[PDB]
Paper text:
Mycobacteria synthesize intracellular polymethylated polysaccharides (PMPS) of 6-O-methylglucose (MGLP) and of 3-O-methylmannose (MMP), both proposed to sequester and protect newly formed fatty-acyl CoA chains in the cytoplasm, thus modulating fatty acid (FA) metabolism and indirectly the lipidic cell envelope. MMP is composed of a linear chain of 11 to 14 units of α-(1→4)-linked 3-O-methyl-D-mannose (3-O-MeMan), blocked in the reducing end by a methyl aglycon, and with an unmethylated mannose at the nonreducing end. Using a combination of MMP purification and chemoenzymatic syntheses of intermediates, we identified the biosynthetic mechanism of MMP, relying on two enzymes that we characterized biochemically and structurally: a previously undescribed α–endomannosidase that hydrolyses MMP into defined-sized mannoligosaccharides that prime the elongation of new daughter MMP chains by a rare α-(1→4)-mannosyltransferase. In this elegant mechanism, MmpH serves as the recycling enzyme that hydrolyses mature MMP into defined-size smaller oligomannosides that are, in turn, substrates for ManT and MeT1 activities for further processing into new daughter MMP chains.
The structure of recombinant ManT from M. hassiacum was determined at 2.75 Å resolution from monoclinic (space group C2) crystals containing two molecules in the asymmetric unit. ManT belongs to the GT4 family of retaining glycosyltransferases and displays the typical GT-B fold, consisting of two Rossmann domains connected by a linker. Most of the C-terminal domain could be modeled in both molecules, while the N-terminal domain was almost complete only in molecule A (hereafter, the structure of molecule A is described, unless noted). Accordingly, the N- (Met1-Val209 and Trp390-Cys411) and C-terminal (Asn227-Phe388) domains of ManT display a core formed by parallel β-strands (β1-13) alternating with connecting α-helices (αA-O) and form a deep crevice at the inter-domain interface. ManT transfers mannose from GDP-mannose to tri- and tetramannosides (independently of methylation state) being, to our knowledge, the first enzyme to catalyze the elongation of a polymer with α-(1→4)-linked mannoses. Despite low amino acid sequence conservation, the three enzymes belong to the GT4 family and display a GT-B fold. They display particularly striking structural conservation in the nucleotide-binding C-terminal domain30 that allowed the identification of residues potentially involved in GDP-Man recognition. In PimA and MshA, this role is played by Glu282 or Glu324, respectively, that establish a bidentate contact with oxygens O2’ and O3’ of GDP-Man (in PimA) or of UDP-GlcNAc (in MshA). This signature residue is also conserved in ManT (Glu321) and its critical role in catalysis is underscored by the complete lack of activity of the Glu321Ala ManT variant.
Residue numbers in the entry: -2 to 67, 77 to 90, 93 to 152, 166 to 233, 239 to 266, 270 to 408
The structure:
C-alpha cells in the first residue's frame, strides 16, 4: 500500500531508442502518475525528458563509445577501458555500490536489459530484483561491439526470478537462447499515449506513412507503381548520396516527403493525417510505430515478421498482413485497401480500440507493478 519506492536502472538511455530512453521516460512518468516514487539510475547517454516527479541519479562511466571521439585519471576499478563491451557489466557493478548505501530506501530494483553480474549482488543485498529484457542479444547474426558480454547476461537472467519481455517473439527467443524458465517470464508489451496518439478527424486522401532489416525499398517500389493509378503520397519518418537514392531513380522525389527528429506531438499529427501506415519488416524486437499507428486510428499494412502479427491484431482486424519481400503483394494489398473507404474505417476503429485496450502506457505501468509485487512477495 502507498507510494512504492522503485529504482529504475538503465545502463544506456538514448532519448529516441525504443528500449533504453523511451522505455525509461514513459514508464517513469506513468509510475509517478500512479502515485509511486521512482528514482532512475542511468549512465551515458543520459535521459532527457523525465517527469519532474522522477529523480535521476547519474552513474558516471567512461563513454569511450561517444559519437565525437572513440585519460590517466580513471577513478574506479570498474573502469576497464578494455579494447579487447563491458558497459553493462560495469554499470551493474557501479549500481551495486550505490544500492548498498540505500538498502532500506527501495522496494523494487528494476533493470532495463543490463543483466550484469553486479545485479546479482543487488539481490544479495535484499533488494527484490526485476529485469526487463527487450531483445535477447544472443542473436549474433552479424557474426556471419563484441558480444562476449551476452554470455554473462544469460547467466544472470537465468537467476532473476521475475523477467519482463515485450513480446512472445522475444519470450520464445529467450527460452531458446537464455535457457530461462518459462514461469520466470512475464510478457508485458510497450505502450503508447492514447491521449496524444488519437484520431483527429482529418486524413489526406491517398497518403501513406512509414516510420524508420528495414524493407523500406520494397515500399518505395510500391508507391512508385501506385502513382499511375492513384495520387499516392508517402510521409517517410527517418534520418537519411545515401542508400535511399531509389527516390531519385524512380522519380518519386515529388511524392515522397522525408521528415526526421519529430517530437511525439508532431509525429501524432502526421500519423493521424495519413490514411494508412506501412510497417515493412520494421521489427526492432517491438514495433512502436504499429502501436502508435493503431492508437491514431490509422489502419496498418505490415509484414508477417516476428511480433508484428502479435502487436497488430489478427489479419482483418487492425491491419492486413503481407509477405515481407513480396513487392507486388504489398502493392496489391495497399491499393485494394486504399480503394476501399469502408475498410479504412473498420480497421482504423479496431486499431484504436486495441491500442486503448491493450497498449496503453498506464496498463503497461500497471502490469509492471504487478511484476514488482511478485518479486516483493518472495523477499
Amino acid at each position: 500500500q502507498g507510494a512504492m519506492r522503485i529504482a529504475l536502472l538503465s545502463y544506456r538511455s538514448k532519448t529516441h531508442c525504443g528500449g533504453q530512453g523511451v522505455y525509461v521516460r514513459h514508464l517513469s512518468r506513468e509510475l509517478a502518475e500512479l502515485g509511486h516514487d521512482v528514482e532512475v539510475f542511468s549512465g551515458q547517454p543520459y535521459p532527457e525528458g523525465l517527469d519532474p516527479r522522477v529523480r535521476l541519479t547519474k552513474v558516471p562511466s567512461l563513454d569511450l563509445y561517444r559519437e565525437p571521439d572513440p585519460k590517466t585519471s580513471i577513478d574506479l576499478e570498474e573502469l576497464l577501458t578494455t579494447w579487447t563491451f563491458p558497459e553493462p557489466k560495469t554499470f551493474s557493478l557501479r549500481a551495486a555500490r550505490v544500492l548498498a548505501g540505500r538498502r532500506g530506501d527501495f522496494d523494487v530494483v528494476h533493470d532495463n536489459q543490463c543483466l550484469g553480474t553486479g545485479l546479482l549482488q543487488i539481490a544479495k543485498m535484499g533488494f527484490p530484483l526485476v529485469a526487463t529484457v527487450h531483445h535477447p542479444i544472443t542473436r549474433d547474426r552479424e557474426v556471419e561491439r563484441w558480444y562476449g558480454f551476452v554470455e554473462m547476461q544469460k547467466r544472470v537472467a537465468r537467476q532473476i526470478p521475475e523477467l519482463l519481455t515485450v513480446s512472445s517473439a522475444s519470450a520464445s527467443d529467450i527460452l531458446t537462447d537464455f535457457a530461462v524458465s518459462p514461469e520466470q517470464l512475464h510478457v508485458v508489451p510497450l505502450g503508447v499515449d492514447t491521449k496524444l496518439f488519437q484520431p483527429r478527424e482529418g486524413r489526406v486522401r491517398n497518403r501513406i506513412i512509414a516510420i524508420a532489416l528495414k524493407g523500406v525499398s520494397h515500399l518505395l517500389h510500391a508507391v512508385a507503381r501506385l502513382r499511375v493509378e492513384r495520387d499516392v503520397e508517402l510521409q517517410l519518418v527517418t534520418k537519411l548520396g545515401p542508400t535511399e537514392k531509389l527516390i531519385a531513380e524512380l522519380g518519386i522525389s515529388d511524392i515522397v516527403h522525408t521528415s526526421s527528429g519529430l517530437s511525439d506531438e508532431e509525429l501524432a499529427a502526421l500519423l493521424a493525417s495519413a490514411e494508412v501506415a506501412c510497417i515493412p519488416s520494421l521489427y526492432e524486437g517491438f514495433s512502436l510505430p504499429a502501436v502508435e499507428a493503431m492508437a491514431s486510428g490509422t489502419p496498418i499494412v505490415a509484414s508477417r515478421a516476428g511480433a508484428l502479427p502479435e502487436v497488430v491484431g489478427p489479419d482483418g482486424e487492425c491491419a492486413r498482413l503481407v509477405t515481407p519481400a513480396d513487392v507486388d503483394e504489398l502493392t496489391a494489398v495497399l491499393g485494394r485497401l486504399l480503394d476501399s473507404p469502408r475498410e479504412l474505417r473498420r480497421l482504423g476503429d479496431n486499431g484504436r480500440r486495441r491500442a486503448v485496450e491493450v497498449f496503453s502506457w498506464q496498463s503497461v505501468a500497471a502490469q509492471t507493478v504487478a511484476v514488482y509485487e511478485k518479486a516483493i512477495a518472495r523477499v
